[PDB]
Amino acid sequence: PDKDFIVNPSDLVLDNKAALRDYLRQINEYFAIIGRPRF
């Protein structure tokens, strides 16, 4: 077993919730343009 998280952990860790996490990874790269959180 070389890899660790090749978007297919034999379905033994969070069935449906892959992209949902990416949404959080891009959430910041979505508001940074329209107006990154800052005052």
Curated annotation (Swiss-Prot):
UniProt keyword terms in alphabetical order: Amidation, Neuropeptide, Secreted
Main subcellular location: secreted
Function: May have an important physiological role in neuroregulation.
Protein name: Neuropeptide F
GO process terms (BP): neuropeptide signaling pathway
Coiled-coil region list: none
UniProt KW Secreted keyword: yes
One term under GO cellular component: extracellular region
SMART domains named in the record: PAH
